[PDB]
Motif scaffolding. Structure first.
Motif, PDB file in Angstrom:
ATOM      1  N   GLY A 152      -2.421  29.764  -9.444  1.00 46.92           N
ATOM      2  CA  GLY A 152      -1.222  29.394  -9.998  1.00 46.92           C
ATOM      3  C   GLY A 152      -0.006  29.328  -9.039  1.00 46.92           C
ATOM      4  N   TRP A 153      -0.561  28.999  -7.729  1.00 44.24           N
ATOM      5  CA  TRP A 153       0.713  28.854  -6.603  1.00 44.24           C
ATOM      6  C   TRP A 153       1.416  27.659  -6.530  1.00 44.24           C
ATOM      7  CZ3 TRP A 153      -0.530  24.263  -4.300  1.00 44.24           C
ATOM      8  CH2 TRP A 153      -1.809  23.698  -4.298  1.00 44.24           C
ATOM      9  N   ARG A 154       0.730  26.512  -7.578  1.00 46.28           N
ATOM     10  CA  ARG A 154       1.469  25.381  -7.646  1.00 46.28           C
ATOM     11  C   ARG A 154       2.430  25.113  -8.736  1.00 46.28           C
ATOM     12  NH1 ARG A 154      -0.120  19.916  -9.814  1.00 46.28           N
ATOM     13  NH2 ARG A 154      -1.786  21.043 -11.207  1.00 46.28           N
ATOM     14  N   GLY A 155       2.386  26.133  -9.756  1.00 49.97           N
ATOM     15  CA  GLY A 155       3.239  25.946 -10.895  1.00 49.97           C
ATOM     16  C   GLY A 155       4.779  26.751 -10.571  1.00 49.97           C
TER      17      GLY A 155
ATOM     18  N   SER B 269      -7.848  26.616  -7.660  1.00 48.71           N
ATOM     19  CA  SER B 269      -7.433  25.609  -8.513  1.00 48.71           C
ATOM     20  C   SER B 269      -7.999  25.554  -9.862  1.00 48.71           C
ATOM     21  CB  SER B 269      -7.387  24.296  -7.964  1.00 48.71           C
ATOM     22  OG  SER B 269      -7.019  23.006  -8.593  1.00 48.71           O
ATOM     23  N   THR B 270      -7.260  25.187 -10.890  1.00 46.70           N
ATOM     24  CA  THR B 270      -7.902  25.275 -12.411  1.00 46.70           C
ATOM     25  C   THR B 270      -7.911  23.587 -12.638  1.00 46.70           C
ATOM     26  OG1 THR B 270      -5.892  25.071 -13.485  1.00 46.70           O
ATOM     27  CG2 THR B 270      -6.717  27.246 -12.938  1.00 46.70           C
ATOM     28  N   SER B 271      -7.797  22.806 -11.660  1.00 48.61           N
ATOM     29  CA  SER B 271      -7.939  21.357 -12.110  1.00 48.61           C
ATOM     30  C   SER B 271      -8.725  20.401 -10.926  1.00 48.61           C
ATOM     31  CB  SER B 271      -6.303  20.780 -12.061  1.00 48.61           C
ATOM     32  OG  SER B 271      -5.922  20.978 -10.720  1.00 48.61           O
TER      33      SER B 271
ATOM     34  N   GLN C  99      -0.887  32.090 -12.677  1.00 46.17           N
ATOM     35  CA  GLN C  99      -1.484  30.945 -13.376  1.00 46.17           C
ATOM     36  C   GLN C  99      -1.117  31.070 -14.917  1.00 46.17           C
ATOM     37  OE1 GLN C  99      -2.969  28.199 -12.267  1.00 46.17           O
ATOM     38  NE2 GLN C  99      -3.447  27.193 -14.081  1.00 46.17           N
ATOM     39  N   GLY C 100      -1.208  32.255 -15.558  1.00 46.26           N
ATOM     40  CA  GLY C 100      -0.857  32.387 -16.642  1.00 46.26           C
ATOM     41  C   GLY C 100      -1.641  33.368 -17.638  1.00 46.26           C
ATOM     42  N   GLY C 101      -1.474  33.753 -19.028  1.00 47.03           N
ATOM     43  CA  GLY C 101      -2.257  34.705 -19.540  1.00 47.03           C
ATOM     44  C   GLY C 101      -3.595  34.328 -20.097  1.00 47.03           C
TER      45      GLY C 101
ATOM     46  N   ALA D 263       0.967  37.832 -12.627  1.00 46.75           N
ATOM     47  CA  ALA D 263       2.570  37.578 -13.050  1.00 46.75           C
ATOM     48  C   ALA D 263       2.523  37.677 -14.506  1.00 46.75           C
ATOM     49  CB  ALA D 263       3.070  36.230 -12.501  1.00 46.75           C
ATOM     50  N   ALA D 264       1.406  37.272 -15.217  1.00 47.10           N
ATOM     51  CA  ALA D 264       1.168  37.180 -16.764  1.00 47.10           C
ATOM     52  C   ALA D 264       1.254  38.665 -17.534  1.00 47.10           C
ATOM     53  CB  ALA D 264      -0.031  36.610 -17.034  1.00 47.10           C
TER      54      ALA D 264
ATOM     55  N   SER E 197      14.579  28.943 -18.283  1.00 46.75           N
ATOM     56  CA  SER E 197      13.341  28.957 -17.283  1.00 46.75           C
ATOM     57  C   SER E 197      12.289  30.016 -17.821  1.00 46.75           C
ATOM     58  CB  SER E 197      13.877  29.317 -15.951  1.00 46.75           C
ATOM     59  OG  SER E 197      14.512  30.306 -15.812  1.00 46.75           O
ATOM     60  N   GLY E 198      12.808  31.023 -18.363  1.00 46.34           N
ATOM     61  CA  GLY E 198      12.035  32.024 -19.147  1.00 46.34           C
ATOM     62  C   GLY E 198      10.829  31.702 -19.981  1.00 46.34           C
TER      63      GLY E 198
ATOM     64  N   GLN F  96      15.908  35.583 -12.846  1.00 46.59           N
ATOM     65  CA  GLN F  96      14.434  35.765 -13.441  1.00 46.59           C
ATOM     66  C   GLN F  96      13.207  35.112 -12.750  1.00 46.59           C
ATOM     67  OE1 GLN F  96      13.755  32.250 -14.678  1.00 46.59           O
ATOM     68  NE2 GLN F  96      14.163  32.596 -16.885  1.00 46.59           N
TER      69      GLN F  96
ATOM     70  N   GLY G 128      12.442  38.857 -11.384  1.00 47.51           N
ATOM     71  CA  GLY G 128      12.082  38.772 -12.603  1.00 47.51           C
ATOM     72  C   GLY G 128      10.641  38.164 -12.775  1.00 47.51           C
TER      73      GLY G 128
HETATM   74  N1  LIG Z   1       9.075  31.203 -16.032  1.00 50.77           N
HETATM   75  C1  LIG Z   1       9.749  32.405 -15.866  1.00 50.77           C
HETATM   76  O1  LIG Z   1      10.754  32.767 -15.658  1.00 50.77           O
HETATM   77  C2  LIG Z   1       8.743  33.766 -15.875  1.00 50.77           C
HETATM   78  C3  LIG Z   1       7.246  33.304 -16.220  1.00 50.77           C
HETATM   79  N2  LIG Z   1       6.240  34.202 -15.871  1.00 50.77           N
HETATM   80  C4  LIG Z   1       4.950  33.988 -16.140  1.00 50.77           C
HETATM   81  O2  LIG Z   1       4.452  33.319 -15.056  1.00 50.77           O
HETATM   82  C5  LIG Z   1       3.248  32.758 -15.600  1.00 50.77           C
HETATM   83  C6  LIG Z   1       3.331  30.991 -15.121  1.00 50.77           C
HETATM   84  O3  LIG Z   1       4.520  30.491 -15.492  1.00 50.77           O
HETATM   85  P1  LIG Z   1       4.907  29.105 -14.976  1.00 50.77           P
HETATM   86  O4  LIG Z   1       4.876  29.167 -13.254  1.00 50.77           O
HETATM   87  O5  LIG Z   1       6.192  28.741 -15.431  1.00 50.77           O
HETATM   88  O6  LIG Z   1       3.750  28.042 -15.352  1.00 50.77           O
HETATM   89  P2  LIG Z   1       3.739  26.520 -14.838  1.00 50.77           P
HETATM   90  O7  LIG Z   1       3.227  25.455 -15.876  1.00 50.77           O
HETATM   91  O8  LIG Z   1       4.878  26.060 -14.044  1.00 50.77           O
HETATM   92  O9  LIG Z   1       2.397  26.382 -13.857  1.00 50.77           O
HETATM   93  C7  LIG Z   1       1.299  27.024 -14.206  1.00 50.77           C
HETATM   94  C8  LIG Z   1      -0.002  25.929 -13.751  1.00 50.77           C
HETATM   95  O10 LIG Z   1      -0.074  24.697 -14.375  1.00 50.77           O
HETATM   96  C9  LIG Z   1      -0.727  23.705 -13.338  1.00 50.77           C
HETATM   97  N3  LIG Z   1       0.017  22.469 -13.366  1.00 50.77           N
HETATM   98  C10 LIG Z   1      -0.146  21.446 -14.186  1.00 50.77           C
HETATM   99  N4  LIG Z   1       0.666  20.481 -13.939  1.00 50.77           N
HETATM  100  C11 LIG Z   1       1.561  20.789 -13.125  1.00 50.77           C
HETATM  101  C12 LIG Z   1       2.445  20.352 -12.070  1.00 50.77           C
HETATM  102  N5  LIG Z   1       2.966  18.998 -12.794  1.00 50.77           N
HETATM  103  N6  LIG Z   1       3.235  20.926 -11.239  1.00 50.77           N
HETATM  104  C13 LIG Z   1       2.659  22.254 -10.823  1.00 50.77           C
HETATM  105  N7  LIG Z   1       1.815  22.845 -11.537  1.00 50.77           N
HETATM  106  C14 LIG Z   1       1.056  22.160 -12.550  1.00 50.77           C
HETATM  107  C15 LIG Z   1      -0.913  24.377 -12.237  1.00 50.77           C
HETATM  108  O11 LIG Z   1      -2.242  25.021 -11.964  1.00 50.77           O
HETATM  109  P3  LIG Z   1      -3.237  24.320 -11.149  1.00 50.77           P
HETATM  110  O12 LIG Z   1      -2.481  23.964  -9.847  1.00 50.77           O
HETATM  111  O13 LIG Z   1      -4.501  25.060 -11.127  1.00 50.77           O
HETATM  112  O14 LIG Z   1      -3.582  22.824 -11.629  1.00 50.77           O
HETATM  113  C16 LIG Z   1       0.185  25.452 -12.181  1.00 50.77           C
HETATM  114  O15 LIG Z   1      -0.392  26.636 -11.324  1.00 50.77           O
HETATM  115  C17 LIG Z   1       3.003  32.923 -16.981  1.00 50.77           C
HETATM  116  O16 LIG Z   1       2.172  33.955 -17.396  1.00 50.77           O
HETATM  117  C18 LIG Z   1       4.351  33.187 -17.536  1.00 50.77           C
HETATM  118  O17 LIG Z   1       4.327  34.104 -18.429  1.00 50.77           O
HETATM  119  C19 LIG Z   1       6.999  35.861 -15.822  1.00 50.77           C
HETATM  120  C20 LIG Z   1       8.120  36.065 -15.958  1.00 50.77           C
HETATM  121  C21 LIG Z   1       9.132  35.005 -15.680  1.00 50.77           C
END
Ligand SMILES: NC(=O)C1=CN([C@@H]2O[C@H](COP(=O)(O)OP(=O)(O)OC[C@H]3O[C@@H](n4cnc5c(N)ncnc54)[C@H](OP(=O)(O)O)[C@@H]3O)[C@@H](O)[C@H]2O)C=CC1
Ligand SMILES: NC(=O)C1=CN([C@@H]2O[C@H](COP(=O)(O)OP(=O)(O)OC[C@H]3O[C@@H](n4cnc5c(N)ncnc54)[C@H](OP(=O)(O)O)[C@@H]3O)[C@@H](O)[C@H]2O)C=CC1
Lengths: 369, 369
Positions: B7-10, B35-37, B72-74, B96-97, B164-165, B350, B354
């Protein structure tokens, strides 16, 4: 009855004029319009030809009125009211300004809550009625059922106040700020593959730039908030936070044993509805069902919104309430601290019950008496 | 130590990667990117060559790691974690989930507040460390000095939560709604002679139209607010509200005699900072001076702001805090209810404390022990 309208052209005055036309209040009075800048110009026609705009500072002309409803402002009242009463005028002064609000000779008007106080005042020579702080009015319109029964031990109120509460230019500034924020990242937003962190960096920089329109708030409002409204007082409260306690208790007539009311008043990016998150300490452990009943039956406008997700999102918000006289109260439930702790979230339009409506109603009550 | 990153990319993962680069965390570990993709292609280069992208779902691969930091998420944690543990893996899972947060084999990590608990856990076999709900972390980072001394009897928290939350798409939707609102009255917005009521009327209609962009929030956020976050629980609480108390008391290790924490969680039009208005009931009447010192000296990030109008407007807001590790707290004062009632307003980013920060810090702590 000859009624003078001062400040009819401003923001609160426009809502009042609009409401007076809708309720056809002009059919019951002889309207005389005043101005502090367009004297001589023809007066607006809200159904009756009121002739020309008179001089709002001419004490002698004001003296020929039976009542005056002013939405002009505090400085206006300070300048004119004293000189007018001193000139012997014994007419009714209905004010939107906070100037005379705490004067012993004045009654804060919110009849769905204090009709009896207002009537007793009219029957005993009171000629000055002032609308209360918009936040106080909306709070009592929602919780009147509880306060009415002396069930509140104390109450903490954390508010989410609309831009309009600070002024029309403040509302314009809020929407302008919204446009500037979007302008800065409109391309990125249109690109589904754009980086959210890139968009975020750009939005933050825009909000922090000297070009961001903050003349009225001093700091950004859109995308942010300001946890301080009005001047500071010696005990650390802001004047906005202080008004809640003194005004509610005067309205309720609890000066001798006032209910402690306090909290933090915060300005948020809402257009014209104030919302309040309340922690209400009850003197007794009343079943929630009865609490909802006491709240709902207090007046025709309060509305208890079921504590369900979907319905709360659709009805307990400024988007829903704006422009209406509805005062929804929701998220009603006992809190973790105990069953004598009641949580409540309410939303109300601060230009109607929070400003114009009480002025409207006060005239109708006086006319009816 | 071989550390896998999922989940380093999200959004959260990207904030984490940037923080790990700034702190040079990669110089102390052997990073393995998952990676999950898509796999087999080169992994991101945050300083050192990490090879190729690995299959985030391959149990054997994960079993070769000493630790896993996942954002990555829950959904991901639910699919992989149980199997990985069942397979005999005894490495550290930093998540982080919210999935494992209340798991008896997991410790909620916020070291500036519970380093002792974390260390004890590490020395006794705990292998799962989960970051707490963003709102919980931010509240404790601001009030840790009070809770650490067991001075809090109960606390009522009314929040102002950022888009963003809810996620990246929600933030984008917030900004798009701001644009739609401005577009609706852009032409007359700057004309002071145009009717503010007509402008308000158009903004209200625009927000209510079916085409207003509300796919993610379901209702408008910009220009409004939503007093409900996450699913409903059997008592009147939303899951967001319920989290505050159970997570805070677990972090503090008071599950046998918890501090009651409750309130209403509200979503507002902020980008990435959560703000909270707290009514804090103290067990003793402590001088405000001591309270300020207690709060201010607890950790290196909390910042106590003088209780003054101008400084509060510029310092205690999302605009000021966004993108930083600072956690300001202000409006500190005793309330009308009594000298054991303390008001406080705090703001925190956050995505940092957060979300991402506790994760990299936990890694550094495990590296040290
Ligand atoms: N948002 C907030 O303020 C907070 C979020 N959290 C938690 O953090 C976790 C992750 O949240 P969040 O980071 O918002 O999730 P994102 O949707 O931003 O990212 C999760 C994954 O989606 C995939 N992905 C698909 N398309 C894209 C793209 N275009 N760009 C980047 N990634 C993409 C990536 O996986 P891959 O590279 O494998 O394809 C990435 O690791 C959740 O469990 C959430 O509950 C906790 C506290 C606060
Ligand atoms: N905003 C809110 O939600 C609440 C406001 N109040 C109070 O109501 C009072 C009036 O507030 P508000 O209506 O916002 O004041 P405004 O500034 O909107 O209007 C007041 C006066 O300004 C003059 N004016 C100058 N330029 C213009 C213009 N371009 N368009 C219209 N009028 C103009 C008008 O007087 P003239 O025609 O003589 O030039 C008008 O009567 C204040 O005391 C305020 O504290 C109370 C509760 C709530």
């Amino acid at each position: 009855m000859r009624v003078g309208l001062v400040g009819w052209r401003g923001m609160v005055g426009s809502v009042l004029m609009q409401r007076m036309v809708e309720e056809r209040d002009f059919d019951l009075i002889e309207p005389v319009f005043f101005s502090t800048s367009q004297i001589g110009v023809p007066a607006p026609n809200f159904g009756k030809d009121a002739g020309m705009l008179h001089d709002a500072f001419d004490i002698e002309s004001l003296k020929q009125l039976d009542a005056v409803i002013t939405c002009q402002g505090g400085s206006y009242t300070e300048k004119v009211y004293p000189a007018l009463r001193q000139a012997g005028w014994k007419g009714y002064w209905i004010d939107a300004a906070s100037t005379l609000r705490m004067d012993k000779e004045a009654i804060i008007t919110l009849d769905p809550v204090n009709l009896k106080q207002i009537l007793h005042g009219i029957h005993h020579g009171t000629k000055t009625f002032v609308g209360g702080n918009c936040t106080v009015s909306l709070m009592l319109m929602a919780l009147g059922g509880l306060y009415e029964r002396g069930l509140v031990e104390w109450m903490s109120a954390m508010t989410y106040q609309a831009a309009s509460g600070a002024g029309a230019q403040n509302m314009r500034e809020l929407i302008s700020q919204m446009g500037v924020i979007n302008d800065a990242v409109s391309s990125e937003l249109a690109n589904p593959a754009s980086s959210i962190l890139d968009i975020d960096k750009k939005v933050a920089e825009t909000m922090r730039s000297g070009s961001f329109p903050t003349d009225n708030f001093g700091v950004p409002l859109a995308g942010s908030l300001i946890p301080w409204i009005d001047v500071k007082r010696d005990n650390g409260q802001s004047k906005e936070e202080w008004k809640a306690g003194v005004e509610a208790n005067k309205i309720l007539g609890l000066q001798d044993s006032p209910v402690p009311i306090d909290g933090t008043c915060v300005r948020i990016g809402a257009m014209r509805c104030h919302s309040q998150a309340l922690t209400i300490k009850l003197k007794q452990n009343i079943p929630l069902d009865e609490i909802e009943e006491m709240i709902a039956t207090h007046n025709d406008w309060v509305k208890v919104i079921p504590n369900e997700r979907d319905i709360t999102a659709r009805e307990l918000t400024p988007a829903k309430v704006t422009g209406t006289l509805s005062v929804p109260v929701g998220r009603l439930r006992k809190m973790a601290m105990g069953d004598d702790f009641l949580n409540a979230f309410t939303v109300g339009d601060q230009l109607l019950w929070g400003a114009a409506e009480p002025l409207r109603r006060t005239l109708r009550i006086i006319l009816a008496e």
